[PDB]
Amino acid sequence: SGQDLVPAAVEQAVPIQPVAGAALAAPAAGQINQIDPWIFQNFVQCPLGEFSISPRNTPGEILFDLALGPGLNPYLAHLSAMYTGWVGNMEVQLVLAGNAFTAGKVVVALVPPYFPKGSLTTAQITCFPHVMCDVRTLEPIQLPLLDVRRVLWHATQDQEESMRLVCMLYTPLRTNSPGDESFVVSGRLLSKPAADFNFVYLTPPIERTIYRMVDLPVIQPRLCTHARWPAPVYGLLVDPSLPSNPQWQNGRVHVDGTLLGTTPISGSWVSCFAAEAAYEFQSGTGEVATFTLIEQDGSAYVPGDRAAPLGYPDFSGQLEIEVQTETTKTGDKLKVTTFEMILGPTTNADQAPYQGRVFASVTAAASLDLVDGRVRAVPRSIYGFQDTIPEYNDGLLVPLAPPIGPFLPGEVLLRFRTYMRQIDTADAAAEAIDCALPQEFVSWFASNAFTVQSEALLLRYRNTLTGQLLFECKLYNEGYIALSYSGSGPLTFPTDGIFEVVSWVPRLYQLAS
Amino acid sequence: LLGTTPISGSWVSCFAAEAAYEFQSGTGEVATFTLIEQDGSAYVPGDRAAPLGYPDFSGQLEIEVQTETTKTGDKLKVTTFEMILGPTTNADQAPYQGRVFASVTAAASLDLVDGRVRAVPRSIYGFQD
Amino acid sequence: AVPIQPVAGAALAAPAAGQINQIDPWIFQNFVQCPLGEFSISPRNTPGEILFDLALGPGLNPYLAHLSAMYTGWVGNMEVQLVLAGNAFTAGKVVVALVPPYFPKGSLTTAQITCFPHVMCDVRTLEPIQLPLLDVRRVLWHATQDQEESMRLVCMLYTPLRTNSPGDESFVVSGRLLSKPAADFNFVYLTPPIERTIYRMVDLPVIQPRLCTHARWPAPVYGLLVDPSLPSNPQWQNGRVHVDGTLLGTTPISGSWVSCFAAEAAYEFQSGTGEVATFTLIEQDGSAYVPGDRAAPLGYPDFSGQLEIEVQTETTKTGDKLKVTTFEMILGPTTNADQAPYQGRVFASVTAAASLDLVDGRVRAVPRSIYGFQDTIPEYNDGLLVPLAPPIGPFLPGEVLLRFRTYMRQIDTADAAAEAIDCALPQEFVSWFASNAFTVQSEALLLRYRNTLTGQLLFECKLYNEGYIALSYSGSGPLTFPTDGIFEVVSWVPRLYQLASV
Amino acid sequence: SGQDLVPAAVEQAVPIQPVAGAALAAPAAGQINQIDPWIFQNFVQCPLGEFSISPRNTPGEILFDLALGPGLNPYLAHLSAMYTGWVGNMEVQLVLAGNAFTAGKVVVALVPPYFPKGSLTTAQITCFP
């Protein structure tokens, strides 16, 4: 236990008066509402209460920024489904217990209500009541988080202007360590309610709210399906020798439920389309079938913001599809035939699925006349696959999903891989098509409609049998998972684990490799 | 779960096996499919009547697998097959024991190197629940 | 350590207990180390690793795990302390929480471990961290012969280790957990001491491996070794036994039953290859054989070869009354085998057209030699179902199986060197584990194969509780070992434990 | 002189009673036998009193193991050629003054007489004082 640290960094005086909590809102609420007196005894960790200061952070980087509320406690964020209203202050600790070789200071201010958010430069964060503290402090730095308000309480709906608590990185982090390591101090943030926190009015406990952090399905990735091709997942892996910021359109959801692009909710819709065909027997390339692209069930198609019908193949290649048709010959009614369409651009085509028309063909010399009508196309095999966003118009622009990124310097995209049926002539290896998130998470996020807190979700990946955490990763709020990997060779992981969330982290959270 | 219910929607009415293309002049390549679990695990005969996702209705079924051929010009090719799921008093198919024989309508001499296959149902014929 | 009220021990059990028995007061003075109360924090560990998890009982003290054979039940608090070996230039934290005696089992994040009563001790503290372990319970007093739910301690790595390391080793931070009873530990009711228990270290038989017997083939053991080049995860069906006393598959108790079967004879003089053998198998203790949960009747062979049982033939042909000749069976598939050991249809053949006028009755089958030995699972059915044992494993990276090689009678036409069929446990270790019926604590024992006269170690192996011994061998060639030491059992370890190189 | 070490590692309490030395064996010996009162003044080094802990040592390695006797002193091992008999206890120090960058702990037990030697695993060395 070295005392070359700073143990004289106690809870300093802040220029603020004591603020009355539940004594004001007692005769304006309709009932008597006390909470359990063992909630006030121990400091438990905030849900957004995990941050990290790498030495690649400039001064003026906001480490955490969390409003006062019931979202600073796992107990009060659980009790606030039962109530509509809260008052009173909290008491927040800070575990900044970095190494004895680091050097640097943080400053934790007390931003009042109705202060405009956004910029908050480092010059003006000292003008608030603030506490300055080193990153080597042994004891936990305590600080009060008062409830400055003009109304008698706050509703438990997060649009309340309330007192924030911003932590700017004041001076940069550096180590006087004799070689090759630059330590990343990993702080935590503990909190408990003060002596006069109180909820206001009892209410039916609704789960679908705020806070009620994100949950994930307990299913292994070797069981889940793929969101760019109708197949299972066959092992996730990182690779820094690939297109690093792709621009896919299938299987890209937000973590507030809103699907982004041409992505469906059902898993039997990806790389599939349904249309009302128009067949014709040609003396050239066999048959020609135009299409009028609509949904699979029967919903109409008007070209709006999605670049294609939901579930359209968002890659490039020569796609062989299966459709059962009504042959007008005498002896057989139904037989599924195999067309082949120019799904890729291939430097020239005649198809533009943004306005609802693709054109398939099957090489057949006999006069094969088909009763035209509604059909549903499904893929069979791929020929000359490229992972490029195709031409949804003929050569024009379309409303696309934005490209995947940006990452931090040193963060690699996590890719769930599957293998498509291919038509290969000289090659004997499988074609690898990867997605940013499987379909079982898109149907989990669309069917729950979560509320994102800050910027990103800190995940883990734990093996089922050993119980060993394989890695930790950072699920951003755009539906991709970026983890920190240093090298460049393709690193592969086992697939029998299960993901599990931990906390909300900002974009500045440096991950361990 | 009960029966042979899978979890993923990409597993229903389809299987995956370790192929053995064998049987000589009946219809074509009477392949032998050692039925295992679709995630790559091995199958253990317990209490559920089949591997998970295996089709449970009577009728002849066409399945499309990926064939690593032996001829020149191409290695990978998708050959449609013909299974016989229903009893019909004579059908070499034991999914509970893990060995299912499927036939092709190919009177040629297509040599096919065996390996690992994933079955995909193209079309049933004569459906009966 | 944070808000738990003081919990009554023997002040509550006293109206309903017949006796209240005090302990010797010198047990309250010494801190004795708990079993499985040891961990290590490398800098490669992500936060959220559970360092240990151990329940309050009389199994936390070797003084009290011995005394709890004389008594009916116990009540009261323990008192643990946690040492931590770390200098002043480390950085990291460890949170030790008091999980209530429910909250059943699952993955605990770092966010959830702070919601229990907990102590967040830094990793560079000097003095040990005393903390109470109260006896929160629904009943008046627990019973010593019943593993009922009590209050656990769960220790989670809170913030990761931030250190340097020279170039090797990588600076693990070790930590131990010592305990003693509190002032109100009491036992309840004096009984006679029983031997089985459930607090017994697995004692291995004091027997050198040269005097053992092999599991697969009825031969002595001729040497234990390692070999990476073989199939690393075999699927043998003989010599498989759980440490808790459960046989896995076809493994019999006694070493006489192996590679043999007792059946009912059915002899038909054929005008083809002479005589063929087709028997009605039964269980060798005189009971019926029902095709069930195991791949074969008890004691059937499990290798890929061509066999030759002998007979006992009571022939009515004149010249000799009771004779012993030799048949020839085939165990491998070889694309032609009508062998159904599951249903009980074995197919052997005499290679002679001699008119053996054999009367059919009860026999047994002692084997003679083998032809074409392959390390492959035989055909317990033709192309059909087989409930078999799982493959042996999985091991850690760096660890390999430790086989017991024997040499059997090999009929060959080209090579003279004898094959080495091996197993994972000799049959002295199989009847020991089945009869004693131990109780698995965590995942693996930690054996130690010392020589008797020298007293020097040879290897510190690790016996998993599925019935196989691993060894952290890191080379590539087959390294053999002396076969004159004696296995000794050190302790229970978790399955993420690292041995030393051999 | 850094105080980032552990100077609060004083001679701790051990669960043992005081043991009478030469007061028992006084009326069963045949003569009056005192030794020099300057032998009791200074700590001199044991003859088997030098050990070392490299980082290639596993836990459970026995560092030293020395019975109580006249062999723990260069004075008493020299005086014990003149005598046939001894009684009483010793007082032993331990100079473990390693660097300020090392980390690790040792445990020094008090094994009673008639305890079987040999193995002495690390699980049971904490059961002694």
Ligand SMILES: C[C@H](CCC(=O)NCC(=O)O)[C@H]1CC[C@H]2[C@@H]3[C@H](O)C[C@@H]4C[C@H](O)CC[C@]4(C)[C@H]3CC[C@]12C
């Ligand atoms: C079954 C066939 C299509 C056969 C086929 O090619 N693939 C089907 C499969 O694999 O299950 C017919 C039956 C009735 C048809 C559908 C329904 O009647 C209504 C629906 C109407 C919209 O045009 C969308 C097509 C859609 C959905 C129809 C298209 C195709 C259907 C689904």
Ligand SMILES: C[C@H](CCC(=O)NCC(=O)O)[C@H]1CC[C@H]2[C@@H]3[C@H](O)C[C@@H]4C[C@H](O)CC[C@]4(C)[C@H]3CC[C@]12C
């Ligand atoms: C040939 C297929 C490719 C997929 C395909 O042909 N059609 C899929 C579709 O579009 O529906 C290959 C790619 C990788 C292969 C699999 C995985 O690598 C691992 C797994 C290993 C088991 O022993 C056998 C099957 C199994 C599952 C492999 C068999 C077939 C696979 C799935």
Ligand SMILES: C[C@H](CCC(=O)NCC(=O)O)[C@H]1CC[C@H]2[C@@H]3[C@H](O)C[C@@H]4C[C@H](O)CC[C@]4(C)[C@H]3CC[C@]12C
């Ligand atoms: C020829 C026999 C093979 C077994 C046999 O004769 N019949 C088949 C059966 O065991 O059932 C050989 C194989 C390996 C041999 C042994 C080992 O090499 C070493 C061992 C040491 C000494 O040389 C004496 C015996 C002993 C033990 C050897 C004697 C006989 C063995 C066991």
